[PDB]
Amino acid sequence: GIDPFTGQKLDFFKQAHEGGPAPNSEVVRPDGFQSQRILDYAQGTRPLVLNFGSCTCPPFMARMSAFQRLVTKYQRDVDFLIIYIEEAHPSDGWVTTDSPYVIPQHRSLEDRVSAARVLQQGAPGCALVLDTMANSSSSAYGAYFERLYVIQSGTIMYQGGRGPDGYQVSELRTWLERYDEQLHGTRP
């Protein structure tokens, strides 16, 4: 069906939520730009942590070292993925930013991968993909600006809550702590 007021196909896709299906939305491998999807990154029944953001998104950069600490701590049982999305504060935008990063709004995958490479010159080999230029994953996960998720066997287990900067990472740590405790016992 077409929406008479848009001329576009009618949308029947429900927004992502905890306990609902994790969208198998499209992403891009930095090396070679091959198409992939979020669930290509799930390894069987291991939880997969998703971290959407960009270099010009301050809270995303402020938590990166903490996120990398989580990878080391939980990698025994959990997988992790960064999704590099549209810049929060592009250097050619309307609002002048004093972001330490000066990155024009991406106009192609070549621009976006260039930005992603700046990110990953820190964070030695975390898994990282790009969102498609249609922003397929950002849209499906409601994850523009930045967002954290945990998915497992195709279901959303943790959805990063909007609200003050600081909590999402502490809440994610809580989810991972409880999962690790269920598998192995409480750490002494």
Side-chain angles (χ1 to χ4, degrees), residues 10-12 15-47:
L10 284 173
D11 240 344
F12 296 112
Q15 323 212 222
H17 58 278
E18 286 182 3
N24 195 211
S25 54
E26 196 175 0
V27 290
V28 181
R29 202 175 115 209
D31 295 334
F33 297 160
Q34 288 97 334
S35 175
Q36 297 177 329
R37 298 179 171 275
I38 291 298
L39 303 183
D40 295 334
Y41 283 81
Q43 295 186 305
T45 54
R46 298 159 58 78

Side-chain angles (χ1 to χ4, degrees), residues 59 63 142 144-148 158-164 166-171:
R63 68 156 176 255
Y144 288 99
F145 192 71
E146 61 80 14
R147 204 162 192 175
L148 286 170
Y158 171 77
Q159 171 180 242
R162 296 309 190 184
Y167 291 168
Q168 251 190 132
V169 92
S170 77
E171 297 190 317

Side-chain angles (χ1 to χ4, degrees), residues 74 175-187:
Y74 296 108
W175 193 95
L176 295 165
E177 291 183 345
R178 293 281 305 265
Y179 183 61
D180 174 84
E181 186 185 58
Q182 287 174 303
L183 295 178
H184 301 126
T186 305
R187 302 186 176 214

